[PDB]
Design a protein around this ligand. Structure first.
Ligand SMILES: [Ca+2]
Ligand SMILES: [Ca+2]
Ligand SMILES: [Ca+2]
Ligand SMILES: [Ca+2]
Ligand SMILES: [Ca+2]
Ligand SMILES: [Ca+2]
Ligand SMILES: [Ca+2]
Ligand SMILES: [Ca+2]
Ligand SMILES: [K+]
Ligand SMILES: [K+]
Ligand SMILES: [K+]
Ligand SMILES: [K+]
Lengths: 142, 339, 142, 339, 339, 339, 142, 142
């Protein structure tokens, strides 16, 4: 259980993300925090990055909601980064219900290939989204 | 939260002290070896009890260190299992990892066994890599929460090299002075320890006489009065001449950049130089005007005008013309430093 | 004068900023050749520089006028342009009407600051332009 | 079309393979000379059949090399015909080409004939230019079709120097650590091959005694214990100083070029420093305020005015005044690094 | 107000001349020691009245210096009291100040007492810090009003290092030449003062034979002959090698940077090169056109043309083509870079 | 007009030939002095008529040089009177001008009068300043008419500095290679001439024995086997060390700038590196997807699955995870370096 | 006070800020000078700096009004502007209200350790006005 | 003569030029391709360079049409487009149809010099049909 001699660090870390006295994390505050480290993202990208922590949909992040993202501390292993970046590379911008017909082409032409009948089992494993229309879902395997 | 974070920080903290308890019990061995060798060089022979006790204290402090290393590696594997989802201790054993572990044990297992007592004592100056493991753990950049909060956006890696680069950048000069004055008393004991188990006498077998050869070889001078004879000195001279033919340029660059220039205070100096003699062209202008008036005044009046009074003023008139151009050159050139 | 073997140099020097070779130089070509070197003066400054090259006032310069301007041709550092350059430091707001007090102040406070017989002597030989204004024209005696 | 490209590719492949087949039969001729010389230097004499057999193998294997060079040049002329579109071999022979061909044959035709056996042996370290021809044909930059359409909009020429100045940029450091250690065993065999035909002993007649002189001459130290005597050593010690008084100024530049330390992490470091002790202005202000209030509370709100209890706080107030300015100076100075 | 500023200026002016009267009576004590030592080194002995007189003038003139230092410090304390509102000779004596005040008297109190007469005489080359105190007082930057009304808008402090780093900038080269030629006759008298009390001869007891060692050690050459054999020379050689292995990397930068050119005097050169052979492509174009017409005129127009008059033109038509591209490459380079 | 310019050009043309006729009759003297000294050293003595003839040809040919210098100065004065309105030989004789004229005559009027013959001969290597006067007259920049029109709007002065600073820039490297190899045979004859006049027979009495000392002193090595003994070699070694400890740092910059490329050439390389292996993100993604599908297909299906076939694929999955991040880091770094 | 030989320095220093003939200094002169130095301040900052020195509110500073600023010589260790500067860090929404909660937090949470009474007596005393909303005037006891 | 084991570099180069597979290689793709490397040209120059090879006139270059341009492989020293560059250097206005301008001077005073009477023979071919000058046409002999 966390104690009071190791919670001020997290409190001040949260304070860096909220200059004013409100307890709500705003997209404007993230915009101000960014654009000073070097990179300037689109406000749509800000919404995309900010809705990945929000749970109640209010558009603001509380300290308990921010702590579950602070939990993944500095080790840079596994996590939900690669499992989404691989899909983003494979898919297109806003692909959503991708055709997935070229899945065999992507698996064979690029990188090591599997058996011709092996990809049929992988294709048949996407029955969650009806028939076809492969999305970021069905990734509950990992 | 409970088994999330918390326990993780606790395991990290209990791992941290294992790399710190292996520094005292690693430098104690080196200190005792140095003291024992320096005392035995011209004193009690092997039959004395000192050569039996001080040569077993090292053999004990070299068993405790390799006892601690295994536990530290076990804690690292436990952190790997906690951080990355797995429940087997065989998953996290790659060829590289086991090779590095065996290499570490081999390097830390060298010690004289209670002649060859110098051959098995020279390579004990290899436990000096533990300072890196201590330093990468006793740093707030790698041990904080705000650091990771503001550094996760840029996916940088906190290796054992990023900390060193930051320490070089923010505190230069001193990190070179310590490195260049803590290497003399490591590479000058080695030369005499190598030439004393061999052809003796000379002058390299005397401390403060072997800090002259290393100081005029580190520095790229060389004289030739003292040259090593055995292969140990002949091999360490060009290893102290390589680290020192590219370490005397970094410090020169730092000296050149340190307090020999500034950025926001040069505006004041530029303004001062602009308001100084570069804006005293009025002097030359008045000189030219008064000279060209006086020439006419003393050539077209005063009855008969002597040639000397005319030619003196005319010669100084030709003197006072190029001065205006010379000052205007600097006036135009000063604006090139305001870009 | 110089034979045809020493006139092609002047012809190509003239053609350097003549370009189309229409026989007349315009402020457009002067700007084109001047902005290349780096300085960007006002077109009014271009008119001021182009006024003191021709006597007809047509606004264009022929080969003889350019030749008599180039007649300096190095090693001509004398009272040709310096005598005019050492006048803007005491110019009466570009009107050529410097007051006696301003002239006396410039003569006395700034420069050699000669004796009274040589400083108060500004009234002497000041009969040139006796109307009251002192323009650039009195340098004819020089 | 297809034929006009396939035929050209086939001719290119043949040219490449002939160029590659002249490296084995050129580097086999520099091994047998070394073995034969360093064997005959104190072993089986001329009467032994070895001194005839091994000296005949080199003179035989030097025939295949200059037989291959002519055919490779013939393939080059054929490719010139195909690319340009001429129907005469007399046309494509400029003075420069006919001079270079005979120069190449002359350089590659030197070999000991089955004393002068060192004079005709030292210049055989000249067939090392064939490495350039081998390397410029195995590079995908010069051998591809993707890097020929977009690489032609800039009309860049893919000669034998562009590849070298690209392999000096994308893989630096290693191209110097190979060049600095493949030249010692070329310029240290030469010294002992030159100082044995005329002189003898003189310390520098052993390989490990001649890799010391070159190492302290390459490095700009110089000692004076061993100096060459013949003109061969006295010239090679200078051709190893010229190449090496400007090669140690490149590796230092390369090793210091890592002072850039990226640009996406210096922003994070600057943010860390901004949130660090450069925000103790609050602490300094609190100190100033409390030390101002305490003086009044101690002098006016007390029955007895104690000098020792007011001058202490006042001098500490003077101490606290300049800390605020000293920290605001760094606060202002940190901004220009962000410009 | 008027009285405050006038009184402050008067106090400053009457404080200024104390550090100037402490320079004459400090540099007069370094001349008499040199004269007395280099006279007694082979002339009138201790029994002579000279060794009792000239050794007493120094011990007398060392009283006035430490008498003036106290008054100068009292003037500084008075200025501090006038500046900051306080009426007490105490308070202003901070812990650092009371130590820096005593260190100066300790350093300036060293003098031979009327062998040890060289031990107590070598460290008298320490009163050379007074030049800095004089120079920071005889600078118009630190003593004016324009560069205090406009120099305070950037909050810059005119300490004793800003003046030095400004003199190094506006007058470089000379500040290094004076420093590097006024140190020889300070570090070459020391060597012969150290090697005469213990050793003798060795051509290191002659001044012109000791300005050779420092010149070939400062430059980092070293020869091997004429090397010091005592602990004073063996240390001063190192202290003149360190200061001189990083002082010859600054004057080289200055000589390479000494106003090669600027934009104003390089735009003209760029225009000259643009109008020069970078714009003779008309020549190559005319060559190509004349050649391609002559080919037809000599092939078809001739009733019976020969090969020697048709390929002679073609083998230089191939020469006249790549020349156009070779000049267009330079044209593109000039038009792209060095605008 | 035409006359006012044609007459000036006529005087310029008839003046430029005097500084050219003063070069042949200036270098002929040096050649004859060298030949006469080298002949007299060990051959026909003073009694031979050669020592009276060749020592008189120099004394005769030194009359024409100082006769031509006066006429050249008269032409300069005539030009200075033609261009500026004045008619008097007394005006325009400033203090500097007459002093420079007498200094020139003094320097150019030293010759061995028909021992002291080596004292009065080594300062004859001072007529080498005439090369500058010839070069500033045989330059198109200072003599053409295309300039002075584009070169006058920037007020640049075409003195003897601008030509040198342009010749150092447009043709670098060669202006140092013809300066560092034309100084050896000037500074190595001087040492020989200085040490053959002191009845010395050291090793450095042969030309090839004195081109070794200068080559290992110019180069900052030094051995100590041969060192000069008189006060001439001691001092010319210093003046060849000073000029040469700051001349080897100027050619390294040039070679480093020549071992690089331009932006229009690096754009193609950046595009190639972008399209190269840094596009294996697809490969890594396919590898990760294949591995994560095999894990499930192997552990859930096929009756009962052994642990080995699961742990192998999971270990390879952990191997394949971090390659994607390692290549994304290079992607980001290349994007940062692209601008 | 100082004789005329020590007043020309001050006269030329004053003329440095005032290019034109009139002896009135305004916002334009300070703006030009500070922009020549390099910094870019807000016009309101210039108005505040001007209002700091003037005693009549006319908007112009005369030479007698400028002598009091010139009296502030180099004097590195000074105690005049530092007391003013060490107030913006505790400014309460620009108005500088300095509330009791803010003042107590500033005095206790950050700074030098002290007892609760020893850190709250000054707030409890409130020896500036006593009504509340302490302005900048509390530094009068100095 | 070509074989499938070597026809992949041309295909990947075509994919490099044409991002998406739709059969269009028009100004849109080439503009981005050129601007990626710099040296931003005028869209008129893009049209001029894109019509350098065409058979249908649709403005689209197919793979068979692109292969005849890819045939210009290495050994860039050839006799292709050098004549075009020379004519562009020696081009006047927009067509260069003037009566040889100074062609006689160019032939008889540049390089190795030609015959005075040879200019008539050189211009004898002319435009054949009497259409000004060659205009880069009538170069079958050349
Ligand atoms: Ca908020
Ligand atoms: Ca939420
Ligand atoms: Ca025109
Ligand atoms: Ca006109
Ligand atoms: Ca005003
Ligand atoms: Ca006012
Ligand atoms: Ca397309
Ligand atoms: Ca088409
Ligand atoms: K060196
Ligand atoms: K050296
Ligand atoms: K040496
Ligand atoms: K030596």
């Amino acid at each position: 259980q966390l104690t009071e001699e190791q919670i001020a660090e997290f409190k001040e870390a949260f304070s860096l993300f909220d200059k004013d006295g409100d307890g709500t994390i705003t997209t404007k505050e993230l915009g101000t925090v960014m654009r000073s480290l070097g990179q300037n993202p689109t406000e749509a990208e800000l919404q995309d990055m900010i809705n990945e922590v929000d749970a109640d949909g209010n558009g603001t992040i509380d300290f308990p909601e921010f702590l579950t993202m602070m939990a993944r501390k500095m080790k840079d292993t596994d996590s939900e980064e690669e499992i989404r970046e691989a899909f983003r590379v494979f898919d297109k911008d806003g692909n959503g219900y991708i055709s997935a017909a070229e899945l065999r082409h992507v698996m064979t032409n690029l990188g090591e290939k599997l058996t011709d009948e092996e990809v049929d089992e992988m294709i048949r494993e996407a029955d969650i989204d009806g028939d076809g229309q492969v999305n970021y879902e069905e990734f509950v395997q990992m | 939260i409970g088994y999330k974070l918390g326990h993780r920080r606790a395991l990290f903290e209990k791992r941290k002290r294992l790399s710190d308890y292996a520094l005292i019990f690693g430098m104690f061995g080196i200190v005792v070896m140095v003291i024992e060798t320096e005392l035995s060089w011209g004193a009690y022979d092997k039959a004395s009890l000192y050569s039996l006790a001080l040569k077993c204290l090292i053999s004990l402090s070299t068993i405790i260190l390799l006892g601690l290393i295994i536990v530290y590696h076990a804690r690292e594997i436990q952190l790997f299992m906690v951080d990355n989802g797995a429940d087997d201790w065989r998953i996290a054993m790659t060829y590289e990892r086991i090779f590095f572990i065996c290499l570490e044990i081999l390097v830390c297992a060298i010690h004289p066994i209670p002649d060859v007592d110098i051959i098995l004592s020279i390579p004990m100056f290899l436990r000096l890599y533990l300072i890196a493991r201590v330093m990468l753990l006793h740093s707030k950049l790698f041990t904080d929460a705000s650091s990771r909060s503001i550094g996760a956006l840029n996916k940088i890696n906190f290796n054992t090299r990023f900390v060193m680069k930051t320490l070089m950048t923010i505190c230069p000069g001193t990190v070179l002075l310590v490195f260049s004055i803590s290497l003399w008393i490591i590479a000058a004991w080695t030369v005499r320890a190598c030439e004393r188990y061999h052809d003796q006498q000379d002058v390299t077998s005397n401390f403060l006489g072997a800090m002259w050869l290393i100081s005029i070889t580190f520095l790229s001078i060389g004289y030739g009065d003292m040259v090593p004879n055995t292969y140990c000195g002949k091999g360490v001279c060009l290893l102290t001449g390589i680290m020192g033919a590219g370490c005397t340029a970094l410090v020169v660059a730092v000296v050149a950049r340190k307090l020999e220039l500034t950025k926001a205070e040069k505006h004041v100096h530029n303004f001062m130089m602009d308001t100084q003699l570069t804006k005293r062209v009025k002097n030359a202008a008045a000189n030219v005007l008064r000279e060209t008036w006086l020439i006419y005044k003393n050539t077209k009046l005063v009855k008969k005008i002597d040639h000397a009074k005319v030619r003196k003023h005319q010669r100084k008139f030709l003197q006072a013309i190029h001065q205006l151009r010379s000052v205007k050159m600097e006036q135009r050139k000063l604006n090139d430093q305001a870009n």
